[PDB]
Every structure is written in structure tokens, then in C-alpha cells.
């Protein structure tokens, strides 16, 4: 086969922030009476944007929906944007930065923005599971990449 590793990048976070936030609990008063067995649905989307030369913003649209059978618990959708300055690589490697590494960097902050709304909405603290977006791109890319040869040499 042919292992196509991404090399010679440049990555500099200019600014991470929320462009869009959405929390919903319109059923709130009576949804606290409900048996807490939520069907929490984690959904991920990535939209990159060329703001300037070697300046690309990426937005991670994370959508969380929890439903207690027929009655919905809450909705937590946060479009965690982040202006980045990317360079060194183009094409599939550009797509590996913007469509994998960049929304991966945005995921701790997307998670937290969601989590905080849930706890403010008096639901038990909801933490999204760690998603390796680099692995998600690797799937479409070729499913072939590996580094590591830890040899202990020390006297």
C-alpha cells in the first residue's frame, strides 16, 4: 500500500469562541417529574472558512439531544468557532487540518459550553465523550497511519 502521513504543517490558534449557542428546556417544570432515562444523541459537523491567506476559521457544530421517551429532556447545540492560521500543507492534508485537527481543538470548548448550559438548566452534569476527529478523517483518508518506537536508552 502507500502510507500518506501529513508533514510540514503550521498551526496557530488566533481566537477560539462561540459563534452560535442553543440550549432548550421548554418542558422544564414537568420534565423534572420525569424518570431520568435520557436518550443523549451526540452529532458532529465541521465547516471551515477562508478568512484570509493561510487564515482559516473552523466551526464545530456539536448537537446534543436528550429525550425521556416521548417527552424531551433538553437540546444543547453549540457552534464552537475558532479562527486558526494554517499553512505548510494543501489538498487532502489541508482537509486533514481543517476537517480533523481543527474541530478536535474546538471539541473541549464545545463540550464545556454544552455542559455549562445543562448544569445551569439544573439537569445532572453532562460531559461529551472524547472524540478523535483525526481518527474520523483517517477513516475516509485510507485507514493507514502509525508512529511510535519507544526504546529505553538511558544510563
Amino acid at each position: 500500500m502507500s502510507e500518506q502521513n501529513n508533514t510540514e504543517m503550521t498551526f496557530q490558534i488566533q481566537r477560539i469562541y462561540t459563534k452560535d449557542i442553543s440550549f432548550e428546556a421548554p418542558n422544564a417544570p414537568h420534565v423534572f417529574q420525569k424518570d431520568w432515562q435520557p436518550e443523549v444523541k451526540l452529532d458532529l459537523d465541521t465547516a471551515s472558512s477562508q478568512l484570509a491567506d493561510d487564515v482559516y476559521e473552523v466551526v464545530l457544530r456539536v448537537t446534543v439531544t436528550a429525550s425521556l421517551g416521548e417527552e424531551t429532556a433538553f437540546l444543547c447545540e453549540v457552534q464552537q468557532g475558532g479562527i486558526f492560521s494554517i499553512a505548510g500543507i494543501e489538498g487532502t492534508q489541508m482537509a486533514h487540518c481543517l476537517g480533523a485537527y481543527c474541530p478536535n481543538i474546538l471539541f473541549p470548548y464545545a463540550r464545556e459550553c454544552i455542559t455549562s448550559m445543562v448544569s445551569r438548566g439544573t439537569f445532572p452534569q453532562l460531559n461529551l465523550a472524547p472524540v478523535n476527529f483525526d481518527a474520523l478523517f483517517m477513516n475516509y483518508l485510507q485507514q493507514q497511519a502509525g508512529e511510535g518506537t519507544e526504546e529505553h536508552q538511558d544510563a
Partner: protein, 55 residues
């Protein structure tokens, strides 16, 4: 007489409080903060498999 007109010549109510703003062990057991709370915490963080790396 500058910031507005009214009060300038007074004490600081007591010397500080001279009582302390809380429930005294006497007759009226006023203030009950603990009778107001949500009291709920149960979460199952659904893990998503992929690979080793970082967020």
C-alpha cells in the same frame, strides 16, 4: 450634600453589627436555607470509540 442631598451625619448603624447577621439560639428559629434546593445528579457519559490522540 454633594453626591445627593440627605444623610451625612450618622453612625455605621451599630459599631459594625454588634449582633452578627444570623440565627440566634433563643425563641424565633428564623431563616431556613436548606429547604430550597434541587438535589439531583445521575449521568452516564456514553463513550465513543475511535483511536488514541487528543481533544
Amino acid at each position: 450634600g454633594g453626591f445627593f442631598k440627605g444623610i451625612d451625619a450618622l453612625p455605621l448603624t451599630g459599631q459594625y453589627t454588634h449582633y452578627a447577621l444570623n440565627k440566634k439560639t433563643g425563641k424565633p428559629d428564623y431563616v431556613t436555607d436548606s429547604a430550597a434546593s434541587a438535589t439531583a445528579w445521575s449521568t452516564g457519559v456514553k463513550t465513543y470509540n475511535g483511536a488514541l490522540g487528543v481533544d
